[PDB]
Amino acid sequence: AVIKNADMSEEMQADAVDCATQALEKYNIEKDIAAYIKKEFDRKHNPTWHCIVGRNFGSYVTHETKHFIYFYLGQVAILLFK
């Protein structure tokens, strides 16, 4: 498990990893991963999110100051943000 760029609390980046990785192993396609994680992560921490998962990606997106993850995990990288 490798994280690259982040400013959230350490306890919720641990929550983010333990939410994401077993969900990744649970499913096989990756539209539904980025539905399931964000619905769960709404109900767990805070009432609005957006997540992207995948490979070969580029984006430009606005994160509220205390919310940003760039996973690099199984060579399927996840980025998630408020």
Binding site: R55, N56, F57, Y60, V61, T62, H63, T65, Y70, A77
Partner: protein, 44 residues
């Protein structure tokens, strides 16, 4: 309360390369003779 800031994404696809070779009984014989020679070198 809290404001808006923005970031970008640098994705590195795993590095790739091209390898070309030709397997034939002559290649194989020569390599085994070499592997054996280093065995004698190690022994001596």
């Amino acid at each position: 309360n809290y404001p808006l800031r923005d970031r970008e994404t640098f994705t590195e696809p795993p590095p790739t390369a091209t390898v070309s070779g030709a397997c034939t009984q002559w290649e194989i014989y020569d390599e085994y003779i070499k592997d054996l020679e280093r065995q004698r070198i190690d022994e001596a």
